[PDB]
RNA sequence: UAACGGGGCUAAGUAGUAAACCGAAGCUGCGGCAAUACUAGUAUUGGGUAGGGGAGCGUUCUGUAAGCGGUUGAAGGUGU
RNA sequence: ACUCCGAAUACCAGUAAGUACUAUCCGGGAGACACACGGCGGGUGCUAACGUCCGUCGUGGAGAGGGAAACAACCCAGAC
RNA sequence: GGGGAGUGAAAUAGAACCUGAAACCGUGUACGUACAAGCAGUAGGAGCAGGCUGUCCUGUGACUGCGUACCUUUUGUAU
């Protein structure tokens, strides 16, 4: 059984017991989070498709960790024009473990 | 007071050289070539972080088109169908479904056909 | 207390150091522009 | 998380047999070319040959519209000075039937290592027979 | 292999300096002209170079008047 | 070849009609940073050469310091 | 380099709404005064030139991204 | 010239002698590489090899997309 939900600005096909990193959520570590916006549930041949959302769709998950992702370096370099610029980036994430998928 | 540049001068050079590990020839050994190399790698990395988002979406669309056409609908008609059916599943998921759950894809296609 | 004294905010200002790279914003030409008399060492024009 | 990737080890490539007789060269070639890439599969991975073996029979019977039979010219340069060689469609169908379609497909496939690999999976034949009974090719109306 | 031409005077910035409806102080030059392209009407003087200027404060008014249908600049009391 | 980018095309050309879709660092979504206004939140803004302005990092040396750390291992070097 | 006539625009001024930190003034610091192409109005040239000289607007310069095969200066569009 | 022995706290402190960087040159090991076209990377990515224990880490990198160094000087430079 899997379901598709919307978190961050993104969609996530997820199954129970799946850890996955999302855009930072305003939730404490250890917390339960219930995602309301479920687009599709699938238990075997039985496929509930939302239009947009599945009616009683709820994915519950535990907040594992809030973290910073591995650094990205931004290099801007305009050749022959004496212009260069650097900038680091670490994107914040929330790790969530899916506990339950309610169809 | 007189400042000698050695210790810090080396640290800068070493930083770049460490970023140039794995490049061919001078590009991993020689600071003047490595620096140029590590800069162009950063430039490419910026351009490609954008273009990754384009490449992946093209791939999904190509896969969804394959799957839809196996289920007797064009990609173009399928997306319209889904829109009309108010199904807001992304191309990334659709393409995941087309590979991993062919039956569900067919359902979505049947829903899409009905909307058209 | 010799380790605790400090100038007023605004009192001290770092001098301009031309020709120390791109980031400073005074690299290369050192704010002299490109070529001409005024860019040359000893290239001032009599008021 | 990550988009699926077809694995060169795992990818299932099916044998098919296409009859070229009476088919527009180009229109035929474009379909074959897409099948060789595996654009027709949901597992289509650009860096992997997940395509299908295509046998073509009756390649000498491939059709062409207009005055293309007498006017379509195939060029080759030997790389010797003044080493350009021309043959028309009709003459190349006589000399080397199979080349006509193979050339068509080759153009429509990507350039480089993988694209050369894809073309390897095209087995064109002038007659009605082929040597790949053991591969048990399915008929395919392309 | 040369030009007998080459020459031209400096442009004399002639023209209407204050148009219809403009508020002018006494003295303000209104028109700079060569001859009386515009004639002086009420509350308007004419200089030696035929410069029309406001004799009084008010609003510039252009007007065709008279048997020759000549244009006149006047200052209207406002 | 070499005056469709190529294959190739008799429509995969040209004109049109209908309804789609693809398509950018544009717009939107989600997360984050900054400038400037306002009242921490809003609102706007953040391509950039010459150039102006602002804020910092690190180096040597002086005080702080006969303090503090150091042969139970300093500096330097080389990895993580 | 004629005018019995005569626009569109543009400009000057006034009145008025809405939007906008705009306009102006006085100081500190500059840089620049080789421009390019494209559109439009022209001179020159052959209504030749990736020619040349002006007017005006755009882009490039100092601007990435998508399109135009590839293509500063074209089309779309401004990259925290 | 070296290897032992011995000296020394230390002998990769042995006189070509404190530290002992880089260029540059070797030996060994892992992975790749003999149908493949270009600023040599980048985004992706199989396989293999080491760890640790496979929605890990490390090394390598078949294959795919994209991609003509830097500086200077210029209207404008892959040039």
Over E25-60, what HEC string results? Answer: CCCCEEEECCCCCCEECCCEEECCCCCEEECCCEEE
**Cβ <8 Å between B92 and D40:** no
Neighbours of E18 (CB within 10 A): 19
Compute the distance between CA of residue A69 and CA of residue C20 in angstroms, rounded to an integer. Answer: 34
Cross-chain Cβ contact A52/B104 below 8 Å: no
Residue (of A65, A60, A62, A66) closest to A3 by Cα position: A60
Report strand pairing: E29-32 vs D84-88: unpaired
- Indicate the resolution in Å: 2.7
The set of long-range contacts for E17-25, using a CB threshold of 8 Å and a minimum separation of 24, is E18/E54, E18/E60, E19/E60, E20/E60, E20/E61, E20/E62, E21/E59, E21/E60, E21/E61, E22/E59, E22/E60, E23/E57, E23/E58, E23/E59, E24/E54, E24/E57, E24/E58, E24/E59, E24/E60, E24/E75, E25/E54, E25/E57
Look at A83 and C27 and tell me if their CB atoms are within 8 Å.
no
CB A76 within 7 Å, strand F? yes
Query: In Å, what is the separation between the CA of C37 and the C1' of G51?
Result: 33
Measured distance CA(A55)–CA(A36) in Å, rounded: 9
Q: Cα–Cα distance between B104 and B110 in angstroms, integer?
A: 10
> Cβ of residue B54 near strand F, that is under 7 Å?
yes
Asked if B70 and D42 come within 8 Å (Cβ–Cβ), the reply is yes
Specify whether the CB–CB gap between A5 and A53 falls below 8 A. Answer: no
Residue A6: strand pairing partners: A11
Partner D contacted by B96 (CB < 8 A): yes
Q: Contact C28/A84, CB-based, under 8 Å?
A: no
Technique used to solve these coordinates: cryo-EM
Nucleotide nearest to C29 (CA to C1'): F50
User: Among D55, D61, D57, D62, which residue's Cα sits nearest to residue D138?
Assistant: D55
Q: Are strands D53-57 and D15-19 parallel, antiparallel or unpaired?
A: parallel
Which residues 71-130 in chain D have a CB closer than 7 A to strand H?
110-117
What residues of chain A lie within 8 A of the CB of C28, using their CB? 82
Nearest CA in chain D to B61: D42
Touching check for B29 and chain D: CB below 8 Å? no
| CA distance linking residue E46 with residue E54, whole number of Å | 9
Q: Reply yes or no: is the peptide bond before residue A52 cis, omega within 30 of 0.
A: yes
Angstrom distance, E18 CA to G13 C1': 8
Which residues 6+ apart lie within 8 Å of A11 measured at CB?
A4, A5, A39, B89, B90, B92, B93
Distance from CA of B94 to the nearest CA of D (A): 11
C29 CB neighbours strand F below 7 A = yes
CA of B32 to C1' of H21 (A): 17
Closest nt to E17 (CA→C1')? G12
Gap between the Cα atoms of B75 and B64, Å rounded: 6
Strand locations in chain B (E) = none
Q: Within an 8 Å CB–CB cutoff, is residue D116 touching chain B?
A: no
At a CB cut-off of 8 Å and minimum separation 6, what does B19 contact? B34, B38, B41
The total number of residues written for chain D in this structure: 142
**CB-CB under 8 Å, B100 with D3:** no
C43 touches chain A (CB under 8 A): no
Which chain H positions have some atom within 7 A of a protein CB? Answer: 21-24, 35-37, 39-47, 55, 59-67, 69-74, 77-78
- Fill in the DSSP letter of residue D59: G
């Amino acid at each position: 059984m899997y379901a598709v939900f919307q978190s961050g600005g993104k969609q996530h096909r997820v199954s129970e017991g799946q850890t996955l990193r999302l855009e930072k959520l305003d939730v404490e570590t250890g917390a339960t989070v219930e995602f309301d916006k479920v687009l599709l549930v699938a238990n075997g041949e039985d496929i509930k498709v939302g239009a947009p959302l599945v009616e009683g769709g709820k994915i519950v998950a535990e907040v594992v960790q809030h973290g910073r992702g591995d650094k990205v370096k931004i290099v801007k370099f305009r050749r022959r024009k004496h212009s260069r610029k650097q900038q680091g980036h670490r994107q914040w994430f929330t790790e969530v473990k899916i506990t339950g998928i309610n169809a | 007071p007189r400042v000698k540049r050695g210790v810090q001068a080396r640290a800068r050079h070493k930083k770049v050289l460490k970023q140039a590990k794995g490049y061919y020839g001078a590009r991993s050994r020689v600071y003047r070539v490595a620096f140029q190399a590590v800069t162009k790698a950063g430039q490419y990395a910026y351009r490609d972080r954008r273009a990754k988002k384009r490449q992946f979406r093209q791939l999904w669309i190509a896969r969804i088109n394959a799957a839809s056409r196996q289920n007797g609908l064009s990609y173009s008609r399928f997306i319209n169908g889904l829109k009309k059916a108010s199904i807001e599943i992304d191309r990334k998921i659709l393409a995941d479904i087309a590979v991993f759950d062919k039956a569900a894809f067919a359902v979505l296609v049947e829903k899409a056909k009905a909307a058209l | 207390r010799l380790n605790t004294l400090a100038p007023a905010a605004g009192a001290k200002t770092s001098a301009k150091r031309v020709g120390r790279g791109i980031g400073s914003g005074l690299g290369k030409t050192g704010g002299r522009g490109h070529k001409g008399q005024k860019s040359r060492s000893g290239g001032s024009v009599r008021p | 998380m990550k988009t699926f990737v077809a694995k060169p080890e795992t990818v299932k490539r099916d044998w098919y047999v296409v009859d070229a007789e009476g088919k527009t060269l180009g229109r035929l070639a474009s379909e074959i070319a897409s099948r060789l890439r595996g654009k027709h599969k949901a597992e289509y991975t650009p860096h992997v040959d997940a395509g299908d073996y295509i046998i073509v029979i009756n390649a000498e019977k491939v059709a062409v519209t207009g005055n293309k039979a007498k006017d379509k010219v195939y060029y080759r340069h030997s790389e010797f000075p003044g080493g350009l060689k021309s043959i028309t469609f009709e003459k190349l169908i006589d000399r080397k039937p199979e080349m006509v379609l193979e050339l068509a497909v080759k153009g429509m496939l990507p350039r480089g290592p993988l694209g050369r690999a894809m073309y390897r999976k095209l087995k064109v034949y002038a007659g009605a027979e082929h040597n790949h009974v053991a591969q048990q090719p399915q008929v395919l109306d392309i | 292999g040369s030009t007998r031409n080459g020459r031209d005077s400096e442009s004399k910035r002639l023209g209407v300096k204050r148009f219809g409806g403009e508020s002018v102080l006494a003295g303000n030059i209104i028109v700079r002209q060569r001859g009386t392209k515009f004639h002086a009407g009420n509350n308007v003087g004419i200089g030696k170079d035929h410069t029309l200027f406001a004799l009084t404060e008010g609003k510039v008014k252009f007007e065709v008047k008279g048997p020759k249908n000549r244009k006149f600049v006047s200052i209207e009391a406002e």
